[PDB]
Amino acid sequence: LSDFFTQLGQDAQLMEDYKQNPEAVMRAHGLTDEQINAVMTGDMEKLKTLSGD
Amino acid sequence: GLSDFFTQLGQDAQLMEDYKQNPEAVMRAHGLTDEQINAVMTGDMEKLKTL
Amino acid sequence: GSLVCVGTGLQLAGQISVLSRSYIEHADIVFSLLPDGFSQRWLTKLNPNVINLQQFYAQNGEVKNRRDTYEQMVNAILDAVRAGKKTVCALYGHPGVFACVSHMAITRAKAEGFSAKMEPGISAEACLWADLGIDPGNSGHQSFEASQFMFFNHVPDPTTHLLLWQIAIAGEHTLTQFHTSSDRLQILVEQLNQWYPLDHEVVIYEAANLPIQAPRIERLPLANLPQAHLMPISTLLIPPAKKLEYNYAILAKLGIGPEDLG
Amino acid sequence: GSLVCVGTGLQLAGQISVLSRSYIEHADIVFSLLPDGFSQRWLTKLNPNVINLQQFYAQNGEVKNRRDTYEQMVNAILDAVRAGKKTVCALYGHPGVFACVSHMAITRAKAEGFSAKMEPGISAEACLWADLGIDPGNSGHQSFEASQFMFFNHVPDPTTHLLLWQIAIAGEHTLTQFHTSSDRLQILVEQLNQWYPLDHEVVIYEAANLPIQAPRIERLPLANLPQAHLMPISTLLIPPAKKLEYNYAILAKLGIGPEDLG
Ligand SMILES: C[S@@+](CC[C@H](N)C(=O)[O-])C[C@H]1O[C@@H](n2cnc3c(N)ncnc32)[C@H](O)[C@@H]1O
Numbered sequence: 332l333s334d335f336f337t338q339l340g341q342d343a344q345l346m347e348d349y350k351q352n353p354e355a356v357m358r359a360h361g362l363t364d365e366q367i368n369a370v371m372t373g374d375m376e377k378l379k380t381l382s383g384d
Numbered sequence: 385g386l387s388d389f390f391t392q393l394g395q396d397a398q399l400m401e402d403y404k405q406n407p408e409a410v411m412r413a414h415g416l417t418d419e420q421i422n423a424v425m426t427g428d429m430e431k432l433k434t435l
Numbered sequence: 436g437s438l439v440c441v442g443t444g445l446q447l448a449g450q451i452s453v454l455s456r457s458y459i460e461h462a463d464i465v466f467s468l469l470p471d472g473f474s475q476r477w478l479t480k481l482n483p484n485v486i487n488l489q490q491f492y493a494q495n496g497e498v499k500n501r502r503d504t505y506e507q508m509v510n511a512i513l514d515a516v517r518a519g520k521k522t523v524c525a526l527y528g529h530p531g532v533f534a535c536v537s538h539m540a541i542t543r544a545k546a547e548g549f550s551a552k553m554e555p556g557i558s559a560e561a562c563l564w565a566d567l568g569i570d571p572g573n574s575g576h577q578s579f580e581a582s583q584f585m586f587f588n589h590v591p592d593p594t595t596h597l598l599l600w601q602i603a604i605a606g607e608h609t610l611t612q613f614h615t616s617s618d619r620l621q622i623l624v625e626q627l628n629q630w631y632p633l634d635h636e637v638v639i640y641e642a643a644n645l646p647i648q649a650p651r652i653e654r655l656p657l658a659n660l661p662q663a664h665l666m667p668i669s670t671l672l673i674p675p676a677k678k679l680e681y682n683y684a685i686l687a688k689l690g691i692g693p694e695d696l697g
Numbered sequence: 698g699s700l701v702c703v704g705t706g707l708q709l710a711g712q713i714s715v716l717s718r719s720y721i722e723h724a725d726i727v728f729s730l731l732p733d734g735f736s737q738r739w740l741t742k743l744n745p746n747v748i749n750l751q752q753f754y755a756q757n758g759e760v761k762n763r764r765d766t767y768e769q770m771v772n773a774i775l776d777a778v779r780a781g782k783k784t785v786c787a788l789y790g791h792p793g794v795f796a797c798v799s800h801m802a803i804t805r806a807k808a809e810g811f812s813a814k815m816e817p818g819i820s821a822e823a824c825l826w827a828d829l830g831i832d833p834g835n836s837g838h839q840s841f842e843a844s845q846f847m848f849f850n851h852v853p854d855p856t857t858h859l860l861l862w863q864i865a866i867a868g869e870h871t872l873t874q875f876h877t878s879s880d881r882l883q884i885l886v887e888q889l890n891q892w893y894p895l896d897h898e899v900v901i902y903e904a905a906n907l908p909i910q911a912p913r914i915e916r917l918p919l920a921n922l923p924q925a926h927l928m929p930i931s932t933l934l935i936p937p938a939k940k941l942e943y944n945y946a947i948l949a950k951l952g953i954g955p956e957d958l959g
């Protein structure tokens with residue numbers, strides 16, 4: 332999750348891929364349904380829980 | 385020669401710190417001419433954009 | 436020993452400048468103040484020798500003046516410099532925008548004969564222009580710390596975009612709390628009513644810290660501010676309340692007029 | 698086709714964002730507006746498919762409203778987007794700070810149903826805070842375009858740090874000339890004299906564009922401004938004319954006094 336976000340923020344190619352198809356890209360990086368749900372609902376608090384912070 | 389140096393220097397903090405320690409030494413080592421170095425030391429950008 | 440203060444921007448990993456990242460890489464030691472644990476991990480992978488300045492904030496319900504926190508941060512940074520470490524301070528956004536720690540560390544370092552400098556970063560202000568599609572040059576802009584706006588005499592230009600930073604602690608005079616009260620915010624509304632009507636649309640803005648996160652751009656009437664849900668990271672945008680009026684005096688001296696404005 | 702406007706900062710190569718650089722690198726085509734030829738070469742090596750927006754500026758001492766220039770810039774950018782190119786616009790500093798080309802291109806792209814966004818960058822303002830060791834939050838901050846300050850009614854707060862951008866063309870209404878005159882600047886001094894004594898120290902600031910270059914930080918009394926050597930990249934800093942004074946009105950409503958301030 333943390334690895335994904337670091338890449339996504341740095342890499343414009345991945346960023347553009349992501350904005351095209353967020354769920355597809357996220358699943359491709361192995362994010363869980365719970366993690367994806369949190370992203371799609373914009374629940375940042377939950378995201379930080381699903382990494383251990 | 386000049387353009388390549390500046391691009392590196394602006395991007396690379398190691399080289400930046402090296403340069404600030406000893407500007408002339410670093411510049412000479414990157415093959416800058418005496419006139420180019422003079423230009424830098426006098427702060428004449430216009431002449432740099434000529435050289 | 437030397438000191439370089441850099442900013443990491445608001446967004447994770449990608450909003451830091453190329454040079455500034457390089458400084459972090461090559462540092463002997465890094466003192467960090469970052470928005471979250473994702474940004475913290477990113478930092479540690481860049482350079483493992485990190486000391487987190489967060490530790491100096493009030494811990495465990497303790498009452499502590501935030502000035503004392505800053506002093507301890509500054510002193511901790513200088514300790515590494517005095518020991519002879521090539522030290523880097525990494526703060527979120529721009530290290531010298533509404534942030535005293537870096538300015539203080541640089542001043543103190545210089546006075547003890549150490550090399551110290553600040554590299555500019557991308558601030559919340561910078562993010563705001565981009566997110567809201569506003570150019571600060573259009574009608575100009577003004578920035579004030581919300582509390583300072585209340586405690587001291589400041590007069591805004593109501594034709595310009597006004598920003599009040601740290602709106603969440605507006606009127607929190609002790610500097611020991613992390614939020615203010617709705618009554619303090621009501622007094623701020625009354626104060627602002629000098630230039631802005633109660634139904635004037637304002638915007639609570641929060642730049643995103645994560646690449647999967649949308650910014651907060653919440654529009655509401657000024658009157659509703661006291662009931663709003665504010666965060667430490669919230670900035671209040673107050674758009675112009677008036678259209679520009681011609682400066683006939685100066686135009687005349689210039690020998691021009693409205694229709695002559697090309 | 699899509700549009701992303703990025704900023705390259707003021708300094709060569711190092712002051713662009715990590716993400717913003719990546720955008721340039723992966724762009725189909727890049728439209729550039731950069732400070733110098735060193736910056737231009739840097740760009741071309743990053744991505745060879747570059748169109749220089751400079752070309753749209755008057756070439757042969759011809760009279761041309763800069764509003765016509767901006768229009769041609771915008772249309773050229775949109776043409777690439779309409780054709781289906783993943784287009785990036787690279788402007789110096791922050792792309793949305795005192796720069797209409799990007800805002801205009803983004804507005805137009807969005808209206809024709811294209812994806813368009815602006816990435817924030819490091820502006821001349823951001824550089825100034827760092828170079829001068831000034832925090833805009835210390836006593837607040839105001840920014841205005843010099844000419845707009847003269848043409849319209851802006852009231853500055855003399856406790857703040859005041860910036861006048863594009864000071865070199867202060868009062869130049871036609872927007873055709875590349876500089877103003879000493880008489881125009883004298884009128885500005887008289888205007889400013891409403892709030893600032895004639896012997897008030899102001900600062901002509903120019904951030905460096907090259908890593909071997911020191912910034913211009915030229916101090917002089919306000920009255921000497923009209924004789925100063927100003928350049929297009931010059932920004933005028935007007936530090937506070939007065940120290941912060943207590944706002945007893947609001948303090949009273951808060952039920953506190955100066956001595957209660959943390
Ligand atoms: C101590 S200042 C830090 C500012 C930071 N140095 C910068 O460059 O924005 C904290 C204040 O900055 C603003 N701020 C910080 N993070 C923000 C964000 N993500 N979005 C909007 N404003 C933010 C708010 O006004 C907040 O109260």
Ligand SMILES: Nc1ncnc2c1ncn2[C@@H]1O[C@H](CSCC[C@H](N)C(=O)O)[C@@H](O)[C@H]1O
Binds near residue numbers: 795863933
């Ligand atoms: N190197 C420099 N140093 C100081 N101010 C500068 C500058 N380059 C541009 N400016 C300011 O910007 C004005 C041009 S408008 C371009 C602003 C640019 N987008 C930015 O982000 O800064 C100049 O008239 C001056 O006020």
Ligand SMILES: [Zn+2]
Binds near residue numbers: 833838840
């Ligand atoms: Zn500003």
